Every structure is written in C-alpha cells, then in structure tokens.
Amino acid sequence: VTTAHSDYEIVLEGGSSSWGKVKARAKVNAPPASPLLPADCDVKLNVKPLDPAKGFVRISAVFESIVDSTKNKLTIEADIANETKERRISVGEGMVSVGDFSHTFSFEGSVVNLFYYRSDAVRRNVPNPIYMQGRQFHDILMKVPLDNNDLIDTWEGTVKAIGSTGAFNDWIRDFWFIGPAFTALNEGGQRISRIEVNGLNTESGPKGPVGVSRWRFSHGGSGMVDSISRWAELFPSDKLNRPAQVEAGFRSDSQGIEVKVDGEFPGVSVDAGGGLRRILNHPLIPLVHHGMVGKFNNFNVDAQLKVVLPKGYKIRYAAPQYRSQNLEEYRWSGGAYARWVEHVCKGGVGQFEILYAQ
C-alpha cells in the first residue's frame, strides 16, 4: 500500500515581479536507502543584498544533522557577485564540526561557465530550449588553520600522497564522491575532470600554521545539468531587493520519511513571450537524482497542488487539468496530476507546464 501524503503551495506576486512563496509537506511509510538510520536534518538558507552597485550579495547556510547518534554541523557564509555574465566571484568562510572534532576554513573562489555553441537559429526556432551542453571551471584558494593534531596529520598525509604517487590527480575522484554519489555522477549526466594542484603551502598565522591550497577542476554536461544549462536562472541578482530565505528539514527513520519546506525568493515565475508568464521549468538534476532511491517500493499517491495568483491573472493551458477555481486559487489532485506526481517521484522528467496571463 505505502500511501504517500504530500501537500504543496505556490504563492506569486503581481506586476513585473518574480518573487514567490513555496510551502511543502511530505510523508511516506517506506525505509530510506540509508545504510545508517535514523537520520535527521535541518537546512537554513538566507540571502540579503550586500549592495546593488557592485552586484554583491551575502548568502549564509547552516546544516545540522543527527546521523545514527552522531551530531554533524556545517556552517558556510559568503559574498558572491557576477563579474561578467559568464564569470562569478566569491569570498567566504565557514566551519565543519563532527562529534567533538571541528575546524574552520576560508575560501576564495571564481567560477567560469562556457557553452559549447551560440547558434542563433537555436534561438529563433525553439521557443523553450531545455538541453544546453557546456562546461564549468572552478578555481579555488582555501586556507585552513592547523591547530589540532588530526588536522596536522591530515595535512602531512596529503602532502606525502601528493608528492609520492603520480596518479593522485585522477584517483582523488574516488575519495571525492563518497559512495553512491559517484554512481549518480555518471547517470546524472556529469563528467568531473582530473583536478590540477597549483601548490600546497603552509604559512604562520594568528595562532599557528595555516595550510593554503589552490586548485582547479572542470565539469561538463550534456544539457541535463542545471548548473551549466541554466547558469543565468540560478542566481537572480536583480530581484533580490529584500532578504530571501529557503528553510527545509527532513527526518528519516526505519519506517518512512518526513519532509517540511518553507521558502520565499524571486525567480519563481518567468516571462514566456506574448504577454504570458510561466512557472520556471522544473530542474532536472533533483528529479533524476531522487529517481535513484524512489524505485524501491511501489506506493499509493495523494497530493494537492494549490496555486494562488494575484488580481486579474488567469491560468490557461494547464496540462494536466486543474480541479477547482476558488476565484483566485487553482487546485490539482488525483487523476492525471497524481499520475504525474508518481511519475516524477521515480525519476521521470515529463513536463507539467503552467501558463498564466492577465
């Protein structure tokens, strides 16, 4: 049987704005594919405009989890800006703590995104492009203070491994993507190149030695990768005129999974040409990645998508059909919507499109 109870809400804003509120609840009675149970997690994402002249924004992220009687925490906090429309700059710092061990770090990064082609026919014959092949290049300089015995041990072991073996650059990818993540890398459509180390140094600092490393890598995609094909959509620096948030939490166990999500941010709705707007095309990486854990138990589906529009907006060409119009709201439940939900909770990437106008 294994019913799957889920509850969704989108709330939009009028005019030329693109902001939106998102709310989500979920429940299943199926065992998660985690070789360590139970597992709990909360995520806070916040972002505020540092200053619009430079385009600089400040973004924070906090993770706590309890994984089989073990507390894990990861804090990161950074400043990001688009230096060009295909280069991005970031300066940030954070820390990671597991059990009793903990250490901080400060990074200094740049990212460059390149597409394999720029043909304008692809721009005048296809109104809604989806797949777009390209490659990203990351250049990272990170400094970590060495104060613990274990930090010094890791540092010396890494220096010895980098010095001695000639296949460090490609074997590091084995340690990098631990467990099933590596497998997804092939299927999710990505390709990680061999890293290239530009030098590991150690310098005296405030309290003691600090290990400085700078390295470069690249990863390409066939179009399914959102971070490449949709480089412009995922960092809306224009509409961040007020702080935005994303705030989620799951709590897994030996008998089903619990989900809870809030969010409010721009980029929810985009122009679709001819005066009509649309909900943004659903990202594909989460769908195909979750499809690797969603095929283990056949399940029953019930859900309710509830979309609230501003004054004077109408939904036209909603595929599949909605069920009710409470004069501003549209509700989807059962039938073809339920079939589509069951389809996408197993890795399917079929399109459920909503167009609205005024």
Binding site: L276, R316, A357
Partner: protein
C-alpha cells in the same frame, strides 16, 4: 499605454462583442456601414485616440474571426490570447 489592439478590417464580421466590454467613459469602438448589412457591410473599428489599453477587448476571448490582435509593445503581433500546440493526426484500428 503600450500594446495597442487594432481591430482588423477585412476579417471583422460586426458581431459587436468587442464593443460591449469597452468602458462607457471610453467609446473607443465604433461602427462603419458603407452598404447593406447582410453580406458583411457593418464592420466595426477601434479609435486609437480614446483607447486606454484595457485588454478587456483582447483578454475576454470573444472575437470569432480573429480580428482583434493586440500587437505587443516592441514588434510582436498576437491573434488570440493562447493557441493550442498544433499537433498532427491519423487514424487507428486496434486489430
């Protein structure tokens, strides 16, 4: 404002449904006869000096001849506020 509406002359049939929605303070829509009104001789029109871009004339989805267009602010021309996705078809027989 932007996005004018521009009733097409040659396609209009004079049903007048476009004229109903325009607010009474704005008599932007009118009639033209020039002949006998049984073979299509009373086609209507839109006055551009009074229209205030309500979209009541286009968003209502009432024109049956596709005579209202609602040209976009930059250069684009519409004909109806949404069009089906133009598939193509055959016949089947389950054997």
């Amino acid at each position: 404002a932007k996005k004018h509406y521009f009733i097409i002359e040659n396609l209009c049939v004079g049903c007048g449904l476009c004229l109903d929605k325009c607010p009474p303070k704005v008599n932007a829509i009118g009639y033209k006869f020039y002949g006998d009104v049984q073979e299509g001789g009373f086609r209507c029109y839109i006055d551009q000096a009074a229209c205030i871009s309500c979209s009541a004339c286009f968003s209502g989805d009432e024109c049956p001849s596709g005579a209202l267009i609602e040209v976009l602010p930059d250069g684009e021309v519409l004909d109806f506020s949404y069009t089906p996705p133009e598939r193509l078809d055959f016949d089947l027989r389950f054997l």
